């Protein structure tokens, strides 16, 4: 019944996770103990949660989510947190020693020990689930655990579970702002694995979302926790159709069909539009036609690819709140007419729309305004190629010198695996132009 297993791998994954499960808990009205207060004298929000939480039968709801890290610190913060009594102890899997920003540790040395225990936990969660929709996965491709073990998981999940959709929300390293020096190496080795085993991969670059906070929320000094809250609102809006009733319902299995036109092209962008500080919310109309235009703004994209370079191959507009399908109609129609927004020839109709009545929740202490309308647009653009070319350029500077390879080779990754990966990503950015080329 619309069940979604959430796999949070690595620090970025878990910490994004924490923010997601705050939002979900508030949305379904689950308290930190994991007991919803039985109010309105009717089960009015009954079965809404069954997407993300599993009723224990004793009145305790448990998140359908595996938090996985090779490092104990991040998962320990969850265990010594407000939601300590929410998450099932076995689901919160820990490692003793971190991958230390090395794909190889995460893919071979350390990962192979922990993946065995994780899959067992996923099988136990998949047994409880009746008509599972898909696997949402959260991994940082800059970091070791998220790259290495997070890739190894997806490979193993693809054989075991087969059809069940794997939607991967990935935190690709922004080119200007990088947290670690060895990120390019990790990213590329991760992407080659991810290129085969994921169905749809939603790309998010921290720097891009950092710029959105400074521009829309008007915070001079954004944190990761402020960032993770915007990521959560996107995920909420995407799965929303399942949890809450809507006019034009979507599903995680639908995006798959409507967004990836060729198997390898499964990389996407995202843009939740009504990101507004309650300061400037006073003075904004916030009509549907504005929210749509605000979604297709080059700046409001949460990955830092400027889609004006590319051509939109498919768009998946996901509206929430006081949204009329007539009003959505004109808004798309005006976007189809605009020059700045350009569509591939071979996609003559390139809009999947989804309209939920449920408006988005305002998280307390949360940098957002309570707004009566919204939209999360996941877009397949030819512009994505630009991010991959920069990560290829930034990598090709390395592996000319063999710049950090001794680490990766020492931990079980043959040197030819780097050359393989770069060759396959070079084959991707060949494909992305080829589809971009007008029909012959």
């Amino acid at each position: 019944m619309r069940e979604v297993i959430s796999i949070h791998v690595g620090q970025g994954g878990i910490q994004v996770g924490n923010a997601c499960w705050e939002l979900f808990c508030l949305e379904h009205g689950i308290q930190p103990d994991g007991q919803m207060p039985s109010d309105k004298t009717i089960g009015g929000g009954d079965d809404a949660f069954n997407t993300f939480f599993s009723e224990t039968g004793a009145g305790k709801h448990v998140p359908r989510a595996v938090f996985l890290d090779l490092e104990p610190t991040v998962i320990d913060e969850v265990r010594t947190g407000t939601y300590r009594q929410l998450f099932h102890p076995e689901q919160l899997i820990s490692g003793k020693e971190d991958a230390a920003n090395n794909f190889a540790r995460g893919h071979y040395t350390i990962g192979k020990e922990i993946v065995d225990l994780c899959l067992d936990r996923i099988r136990k969660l998949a047994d409880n689930c009746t008509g599972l929709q898909g696997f949402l996965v959260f991994n940082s491709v800059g970091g070791g655990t998220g790259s290495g073990l997070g890739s190894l998981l997806l490979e193993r999940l693809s054989v075991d579970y087969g059809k069940k959709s794997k939607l991967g929300f990935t935190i690709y390293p922004s080119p200007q702002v990088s947290t670690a020096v060895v990120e390019p190496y990790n990213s590329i080795l991760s992407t080659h694995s991810l290129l085969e085993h994921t169905d749809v991969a939603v790309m998010l670059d921290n720097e891009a979302i950092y710029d959105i906070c400074r521009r829309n929320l008007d915070i001079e000094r954004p944190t990761y926790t402020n960032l993770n809250r915007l990521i959560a609102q996107v995920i909420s809006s995407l799965t929303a159709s399942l949890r809450f009733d809507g006019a034009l319902n979507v599903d995680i299995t639908e995006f798959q069909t409507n967004l990836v036109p060729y198997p390898r092209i499964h990389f996407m962008l995202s843009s939740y539009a009504p990101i507004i500080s309650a300061e400037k919310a006073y003075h904004e109309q916030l009509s549907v036609a504005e929210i749509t235009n605000s979604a297709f703004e080059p700046a409001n994209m949460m990955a830092k690819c400027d889609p004006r370079h590319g051509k939109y191959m498919a768009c998946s507009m996901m509206y929430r709140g006081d949204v009329v399908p007539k009003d959505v109609n004109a808004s798309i129609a005006t976007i189809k007419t605009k020059r700045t927004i350009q569509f591939v020839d071979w996609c003559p109709t390139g809009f999947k729309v989804g309209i939920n009545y449920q408006p988005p929740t305002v998280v307390p202490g949360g940098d957002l305004a309570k707004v009566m309308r919204a939209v999360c647009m996941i877009s397949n653009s030819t512009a994505i190629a630009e991010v991959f070319s920069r990560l290829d350029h930034k990598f090709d500077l390395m592996y000319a010198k063999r710049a950090f390879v001794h680490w990766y080779v020492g931990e079980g990754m043959e040197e030819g695996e780097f050359s393989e990966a770069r060759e396959d990503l070079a084959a991707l950015e060949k494909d992305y132009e080829e589809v971009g080329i007008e029909t012959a």
Partner: protein, 428 residues
């Protein structure tokens, strides 16, 4: 008797049906708990046409609500008059088609239909004499289109003589609320043209236009667009349910609307619809003008571009048959260009003494025209641009469909567009 089995297929169909079974219930005086609370004995003389009388004197829609998504049950139950439908008639899968014609026809859909057919067989046999069916399904999605056409194919092989009616929502290029709409519709019409008797094409583009111009709604929702489709759906099969100064039925319409077997796509248009403020004198000539207005047709294609091969008006209420006839003649003398030269007296007429609730007079129009081309060319042009590059094709291919199907679907659909165009330009 002359009973009709309704099959509301896909999220589109289940919503159109939900509103239709509200509208039809009001006419027959049936309340949401199934009990009769009507004031006229005429409201129960031909109820058996659409309902099956149940024990304790309850009335049940002959409605088979099919889908591949179990969330659409929670929609038609939530609705008022949701308690009318028989729970055994509800037939719902788990996964969903995923706006994929291949999934809703060859795999996921092919595993449910065997359960649906058993229910169709059950409700079809219970009728003493079956007039036909009235499937309602979008050509835009995967469930409505896939299962719809597969069911339509199955029920035709079993019941060849009975009338297969199909109120289908075609994807309009203006709206375009799904990306793979063209692929679904193109594979859909290939099956429909073979295995449907009459197919009343509907468009959300034309239904929004009626709500922004003919009616003046500030916020037209899918409930209001449904409320128009239902009023017409009532009007096409009225003379079955009520007496007439000149009666009609589905077969009578089909015999006079379909010159040649492959030309059975029609434009439906309900006449007395007016803006609440602009409430106009209610006379047969004033209603005849609006049903023939290219604004009122629930199809993106304006008849003016095409020419009517034939028409059919199903007038409602207490009207002089002479006055009706006069107006039908008058129309054909004005629009000498928009009525095929051969087949004279193009327009059929029909009268039904009983009007719709809260109206003195009404009409329901049905027009087989060579304009209907101009809505299948849009779907063709789009579909072609996609299929040149084999875009979004690995989905449909993956569910065990071949590239041979997609090509014959374009072939068979281009033959239809060839056939209408022939009869437009033809002078005899």
């Amino acid at each position: 008797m002359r009973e009709i089995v309704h099959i509301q297929g896909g999220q589109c169909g289940n919503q159109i049906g939900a509103k239709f079974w509200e509208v039809i219930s009001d006419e027959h005086g049936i309340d949401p708990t199934g009990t009769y609370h009507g004031d006229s004995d005429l409201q129960l003389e031909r109820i058996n046409v659409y309902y099956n009388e149940a024990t304790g004197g309850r009335y049940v829609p002959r409605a088979i609500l099919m889908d591949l998504e179990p969330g659409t049950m929670d929609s038609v139950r939530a609705g008022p008059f949701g308690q009318l439908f028989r729970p055994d008639n509800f037939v719902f899968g788990q996964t969903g088609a995923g706006n994929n014609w291949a999934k809703g026809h060859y795999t996921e859909g092919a595993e449910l239909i065997d359960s649906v057919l058993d229910v169709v067989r059950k409700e079809a046999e219970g009728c003493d004499c079956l007039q036909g069916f009235q499937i309602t399904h979008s050509l835009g999605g995967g469930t409505g289109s896939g299962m719809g056409t597969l069911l339509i194919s199955k029920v035709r092989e079993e019941y060849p003589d009975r009338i297969m009616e199909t109120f289908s929502v075609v994807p309009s290029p203006k709206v375009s609320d799904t990306v793979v709409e063209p692929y679904n519709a193109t594979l859909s019409v290939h099956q429909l043209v073979e295995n449907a008797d009459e197919c009343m094409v509907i468009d959300n583009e034309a239904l929004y236009d009626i709500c922004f111009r003919t009616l003046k709604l500030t916020t037209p929702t899918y409930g209001d667009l449904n409320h128009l489709v239902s009023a017409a759906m009532s009007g096409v099969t009225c003379c079955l349910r009520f007496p007439g100064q000149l009666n009609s039925d589905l077969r009578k319409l089909a015999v006079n609307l379909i010159p040649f077997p492959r030309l059975h796509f029609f434009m439906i248009g309900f006449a007395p619809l007016t803006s609440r403020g602009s409430q106009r004198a209610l006379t047969v000539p004033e209603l005849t003008q609006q049903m023939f207005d290219a604004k009122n047709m629930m199809c993106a294609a304006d008849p003016r571009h095409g020419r009517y091969l034939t028409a059919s008006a199903l007038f409602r209420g207490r009207m002089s048959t002479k006055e009706v006839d006069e107006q039908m003649l008058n129309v054909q003398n004005k629009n000498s260009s928009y009525f095929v030269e051969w087949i004279p007296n193009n327009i059929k007429s029909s009268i039904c003494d009983i009007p719709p609730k809260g109206l003195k007079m009404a009409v329901t129009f049905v027009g087989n025209s060579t304009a209907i081309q101009e809505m299948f060319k849009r779907v063709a042009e789009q579909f072609t641009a996609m299929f040149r590059r084999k875009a979004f094709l690995h989905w449909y291919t993956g569910e065990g469909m071949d590239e041979m199907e997609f090509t014959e679907a374009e072939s068979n659909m281009n033959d239809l567009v060839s056939e209408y165009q022939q009869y437009q330009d033809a002078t005899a």
